[PDB]
């Protein structure tokens, strides 16, 4: 059984874009590392969130705010001792420029040919991130850095390091400097998982909080 959801934000760019309408395959068992997962937001389960399951139960996960890379050690209730091969391709320009605005503290995303410049805005960087045996793209913002003082600090771990409790997950957005995720709010209980996002049903050209120009039928199909 499939459940459709609309994508209002850029947190999962470039993989999912604002105005995408996705289909979720409801989960039993269990997300694989790197799965795109819809889940009930722990602190407000009236809200559905969509993120990538980067950390599974037992993983020691560490995030470097400067290089903006993950380190993952599985089977590590304490505290372990076994590295997942996590590798990154070289940074390259992405298809998007992010431009900030006022009246509505906000930002807009614009797909800009890589041979072009947008007058106002900052071009996001792109890399591929491989977590063991699965690979996806991530966008970073060169002038942005995570303020570790705002991080969720797990009891008894140092900052920017987490050990995923049994029965729980660590979620991260692909638009890494524009995603409020487990780094800020902690783990996602297994019960809170709705399902895996497997396809784009429909897509509309749109910005956050407005209507759409037109469509993106090229996007209908599996999620890559």
């Amino acid at each position: 059984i499939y459940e459709p959801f609309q994508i209002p934000s850029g947190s999962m760019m470039p993989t999912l874009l604002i105005g995408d309408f996705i289909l979720v395959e409801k989960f039993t068992g269990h997300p694989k590392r790197g799965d795109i997962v819809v889940f009930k937001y722990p602190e407000d389960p009236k809200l559905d969130y969509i993120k990538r399951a980067v950390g599974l139960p037992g993983d020691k996960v560490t995030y470097d705010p400067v290089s903006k890379e993950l380190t993952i050690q599985p089977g590590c209730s304490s505290g372990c001792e076994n590295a997942l091969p996590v590798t990154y391709s070289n940074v390259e320009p992405s298809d998007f420029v992010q431009t900030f605005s006022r009246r509505n503290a906000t930002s807009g995303f614009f797909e800009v040919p890589k041979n072009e410049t947008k007058e106002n805005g900052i071009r996001l960087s792109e890399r591929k991130e491989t977590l063991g045996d699965v690979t996806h793209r991530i966008l970073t913002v060169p002038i942005a850095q995570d303020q570790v003082g705002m991080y969720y600090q797990q009891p008894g771990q140092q900052l920017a390091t987490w050990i995923v409790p049994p029965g729980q997950y660590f979620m991260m957005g692909d638009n890494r400097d524009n995603s409020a995720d487990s780094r800020y709010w902690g783990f996602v209980p297994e019960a809170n998982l709705v399902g895996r996002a497997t396809a784009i049903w429909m897509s509309f050209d749109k910005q956050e909080g407005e209507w759409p120009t037109g469509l993106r039928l090229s996007r209908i199909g599996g999620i890559h």
């Binding site: 459709p4 959801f5 609309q6 209002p8 947190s11 996705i22 819809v38 937001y41 559905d48 969130y49």
Partner: peptide, 6 residues
């Protein structure tokens, strides 16, 4: 369905 996912 047809709700948002943040």
């Amino acid at each position: 369905x047809x709700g948002g996912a943040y």
